[PDB]
A paper describes a structure:
Once formed, the Z-ring serves as a scaffold to recruit other cell division proteins that collectively constitute the divisome. FtsZ subunits have been suggested to interact through two putative sets of interfaces, longitudinal interfaces that join the subunits in a head-to-tail manner thereby forming a protofilament, and lateral interfaces that occur between protofilaments. However, unlike tubulin, which exhibits strong lateral interactions to form multi-stranded microtubules, FtsZ polymerizes into single-stranded protofilaments, and undergoes GTP hydrolysis-driven treadmilling.
To address the nature and in vivo role of FtsZ lateral interactions, we solved the structure of Mycobacterium tuberculosis FtsZ (MtbFtsZ) in a double-stranded protofilament state. Compared with our earlier MtbFtsZ structure, our newly determined MtbFtsZ structure is similarly double-stranded and reveals curved filaments in an antiparallel arrangement. However, in this new structure, the inter-protofilament interface is located at the external faces of helices H3, H4, and H5 in the N-terminal subdomain (lateral interface 2). By contrast, the lateral interface in the new MtbFtsZ structure is composed of basic residues Arg76, Lys77, Lys83, Arg119, and Lys120 and acidic residues Glu80, Glu87, and Glu153 from both interacting subunits, burying a larger surface area of ~870 Å2. These residues form charged complementary surfaces, suggesting the existence of electrostatic interactions. The charged residues involved in both lateral interfaces are generally conserved, indicating that they are functionally relevant. Comparison of this structure with that of MtbFtsZ in a different double-stranded protofilament state that we previously determined revealed two different inter-protofilament lateral interfaces. By contrast, when probing with the streptavidin conjugate, only single bands at both the monomer and the dimer positions (corresponding to the higher molecular weight band in the anti-FtsZ immunoblot) were detected. These photocrosslinking results clearly demonstrate that both lateral interfaces mediate interactions between FtsZ subunits in living cells. Mutagenesis of Lys121 revealed similar variability, with K121M and K121V able to complement. These results, together with those from double mutagenesis, suggest that lateral interactions are predominantly mediated by van der Waals interactions, which are sensitive to surface geometry; the charge complementarity may enhance these associations.
Residue numbers in the entry: 4 to 312
Amino acid sequence: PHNYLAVIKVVGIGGGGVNAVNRMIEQGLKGVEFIAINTDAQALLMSDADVKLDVGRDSTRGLGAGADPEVGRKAAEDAKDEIEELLRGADMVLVTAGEGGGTGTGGAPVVASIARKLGALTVGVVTRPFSFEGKRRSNQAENGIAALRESCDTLIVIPNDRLLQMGDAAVSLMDAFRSADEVLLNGVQGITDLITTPGLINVDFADVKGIMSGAGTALMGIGSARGEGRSLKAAEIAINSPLLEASMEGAQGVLMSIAGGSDLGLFEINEAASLVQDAAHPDANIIFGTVIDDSLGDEVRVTVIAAGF
Ligand SMILES: Nc1nc2c(ncn2[C@@H]2O[C@H](COP(=O)(O)OP(=O)(O)OP(=O)(O)O)[C@@H](O)[C@H]2O)c(=O)[nH]1
């Protein structure tokens, strides 16, 4: 095998998607070309993405979609040519969005469908809305997730409800949607940083493509720790993450990443790798990799993507 660089693109769509891509920029996600997409023209113009694109100006005059998914879709199908060339020749496209709105919910299945005809491995990373946003938002989101899982290879759904504790005690509204911005970041960063920033144990691109092709919907767990025993306290928190909905024991596909400085020893790596093979189904397919980040200092971060129940 000669050397090969995987070209990876991360497209946020809708306000929620673009706000999260903004958080990826600020925290320095790399190896990836960012792409913001919205109908709100005002919201696009402070996206810090390398590529922006408004959809169906005639349809909206640049106002949004008014919480109506079926026009959020039509705006994207009539930018299909602009999208298909923004993504020409990618090996992996990740679609981010908060689900429940109009453009994200409606547009995301279209982006993902385009990336999958282009032969790219297409992974969706989305949130379920908070319960306090009403039932119409929850119904519309559940219709977008159904639409999108049929246009993806893997769809990671994150329940915002379980961020609320697992967060702070006295959270605020602004804080809550900030938390959801970092979770989406943890979702795509958990995946891409295996390809683009491998550590001691490096997974190739085609191992990721193997477990994640046709995987259906998936969930995620995160955890972090410092000190001695850091690697398996973090891996413990990841297996028991509210975000994972205790779905670990019965998952047939699992992609795990452990992130740490170059100070990360083989022994730490091995105990965390063992604790997740133990907590997984015995017939489960597990692919696992180390990630190098000298900026976390003492902290170790574990991330678990579980698919196919
Ligand atoms: N991660 C993240 N999610 C958000 C944010 N704001 C809202 N959301 C979630 O995303 C869902 C809908 O996404 P929005 O961006 O608000 O709606 P949209 O996709 O832009 O569609 P429009 O309503 O037509 O603008 C909401 O129900 C929230 O649960 C945010 O700032 N960050």
